[PDB]
């Protein structure tokens, strides 16, 4: 019987355009070609299914204390992928879990 | 002005053993030979370092009306992988980040 403080939406998707580990943006192929045969580039995409579960944020929070929210974080993916014109492989930036984020309130 | 939940740590990885999407134990190449270029696989991999970061559980929860702890998520990432003579590729399993899991009461 358990949960997670935020929730999260995770699916398979293709991406045009990405952003590399060192901030590159690069289009990212919809082909690649491996042993003389021709894949899709997918990639397992985790987002934030909303920012606040809770009316006050992140599930379970001590509300009085703490304000929250929900986002996500990212992973790198290996990817072939083009800037200007010249095609290289690269890890792009996938987004692959949503977390509460808390702020420890003595204000808000 | 902000903490983390849960908190984790990342870094770039080589497996040789490794999970499979289908829940197999399989195990990672060492190298991937292209057009006699060849690459070894690295992979971001992020992990908790605590399943209890504080002795409560997950940081900033409302411990009173629920127990809490951090624990890795998998992202799927396509490795080459091998058994004796067959090379294969297969999505493969690899800790992405660390979440708040929460169980008590209150529900909502
Ligand atoms: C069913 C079988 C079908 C297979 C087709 C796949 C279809 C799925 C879609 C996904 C497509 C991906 C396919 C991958 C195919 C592999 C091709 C091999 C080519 C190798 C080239 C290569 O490996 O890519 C490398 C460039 O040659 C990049 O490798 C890096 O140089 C090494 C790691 C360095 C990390 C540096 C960061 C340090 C920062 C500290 C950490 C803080 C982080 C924020």
Redesign the pocket.
Same mark, same amino acid.
């Given at each position: 019987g358990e949960h997670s403080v935020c929730d999260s939406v995770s699916a398979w998707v293709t991406k045009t355009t990405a952003t590399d580990?060192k901030g590159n943006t690069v289009t990212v192929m919809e082909n690649?070609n491996?042993d003389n045969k021709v894949?899709?580039?997918? *990639?397992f995409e985790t987002k934030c299914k909303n920012p606040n579960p809770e009316p006050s944020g992140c599930r379970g929070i001590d509300s009085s204390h703490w304000n929250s929210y929900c986002t996500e974080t990212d992973t790198?993916?290996?990817?072939?992928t083009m800037e200007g014109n010249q095609a290289?492989?690269? *890890?792009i930036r996938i987004e692959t879990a949503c977390v509460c984020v808390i702020t420890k309130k003595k204000g808000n």
């Amino acid at each position: 019987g358990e949960h997670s403080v935020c929730d999260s939406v995770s699916a398979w998707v293709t991406k045009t355009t990405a952003t590399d580990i060192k901030g590159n943006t690069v289009t990212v192929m919809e082909n690649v070609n491996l042993d003389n045969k021709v894949y899709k580039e997918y *990639f397992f995409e985790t987002k934030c299914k909303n920012p606040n579960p809770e009316p006050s944020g992140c599930r379970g929070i001590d509300s009085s204390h703490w304000n929250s929210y929900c986002t996500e974080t990212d992973t790198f993916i290996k990817a072939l992928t083009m800037e200007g014109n010249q095609a290289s492989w690269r *890890f792009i930036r996938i987004e692959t879990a949503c977390v509460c984020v808390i702020t420890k309130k003595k204000g808000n």
